[PDB]
Design a protein around this nucleic acid. Structure first.
Ligand SMILES: [Ca+2]
Length: 314
DNA sequence: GGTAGACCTGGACGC
DNA sequence: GCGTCCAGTCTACC
């Protein structure tokens, strides 16, 4: 009863509400591995994970976002705690407003977007996002989720246990920088990315000024930020964009990959013009990214998320 | 400066 | 059921 993951039905007195229409947010479209890889629908329509260093379970109704915290006497979330939720979902950004603009300038978005309202971007932690996406390169979402999970089990701070699940917070730079971590990661299956995680941790900590460095990029320019990020091992343009776009408040960053070429090509008949080659290449990927930035504007990245959600569901 | 190949893993095809 | 193919960075190199 008071054990296991909670539910809106089962322990009512424990949930608080955040005004939020399913049109402005769709948990089933945002939390599935892709932006973050740490949320799990442990119970239908109920997603659990670590948010702001505590475990929560989120579920929604047609006009309400219900939340629940596990921290020591159990109680519905406090108001401030709920804010952390709004900050994470960047609720002050109005999806209706953004969708309208994109629709206005792009008939195809206009079409496709209808069935997939409520796709926004999570404001993630630089560290987690950096390393989560270092694991994403030349890989698929299934393995990535697995890799990230093992990584957090083995190196992240132990949080609280629900049923047979012991939550962990994302590892720290120090942790990831520790000795013999690479051999450890290799044993978890991150393959060659094992070294990348190990090296980027040490690199940040011993060559760029530590944690503060990343935290400074939130204030720098996308151009600068993306630039700086590329230094780290296993971090190219793509991963650099993911980080800028999902944790460094750079909403115009557009992560270009084979996925995107497919969309650019079959939905816009897009061709590289000022570039050289006909297929994917550093110059051509740079172009594809510019194409969408001028087509969608300042929040191009957010827009891309919408097409990706609608696409995969087909 | 702008290409090619190589690359840990493991679920998908295709033969 | 085996071998090839998918799902970004990095480096050797013309
Ligand atoms: Ca590929």
């Amino acid at each position: 009863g008071s054990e296991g993951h909670r539910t809106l039905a089962s322990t009512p007195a424990l949930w608080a509400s955040i005004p939020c229409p399913r049109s402005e947010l769709r948990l089933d479209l945002v939390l599935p591995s892709g932006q973050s890889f740490r949320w799990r629908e442990q119970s239908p329509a109920h997603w659990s994970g670590v948010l702001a260093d505590q475990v929560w379970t989120l579920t929604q109704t047609e006009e309400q976002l219900h939340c629940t915290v596990y921290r020591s006497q159990a109680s519905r979330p406090t108001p401030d705690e709920l804010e952390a939720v709004r900050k994470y979902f960047q609720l002050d950004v109005t999806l209706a407003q953004l969708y309208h603009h994109w629709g206005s300038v792009d008939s195809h978005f206009q079409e496709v977007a209808q069935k997939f309202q409520g796709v926004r971007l999570l404001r993630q932690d630089p560290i987690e996002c950096l390393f989560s996406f270092i694991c994403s390169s030349n890989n698929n979402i299934a393995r990535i989720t697995g890799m990230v999970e093992r990584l957090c089990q083995a190196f992240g701070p132990r949080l609280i246990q629900l049923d047979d699940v012991t939550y962990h917070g994302f590892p720290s730079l120090q942790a990831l920088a520790g000795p013999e971590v690479e051999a450890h990661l290799r044993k978890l299956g991150l393959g060659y990315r094992a070294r990348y995680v190990s090296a980027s941790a040490r690199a940040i900590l011993e060559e760029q000024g530590g944690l503060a460095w990343l935290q400074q990029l939130r204030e720098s320019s996308y151009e600068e930020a993306h630039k700086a990020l590329c230094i780290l091992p296993g971090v190219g343009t793509k991963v650099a964009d993911c980080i800028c776009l999902m944790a460094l408040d750079k909403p115009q960053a557009v992560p270009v990959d084979v996925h995107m070429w497919h969309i650019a090509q079959r939905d816009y008949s897009w061709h590289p013009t000022t570039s050289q080659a006909k297929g994917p290449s550093p110059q051509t990927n740079k172009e594809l990214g510019n194409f969408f930035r001028s087509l969608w504007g300042p929040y191009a990245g957010w827009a891309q998320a919408v097409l990706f959600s609608a696409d995969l569901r087909q």
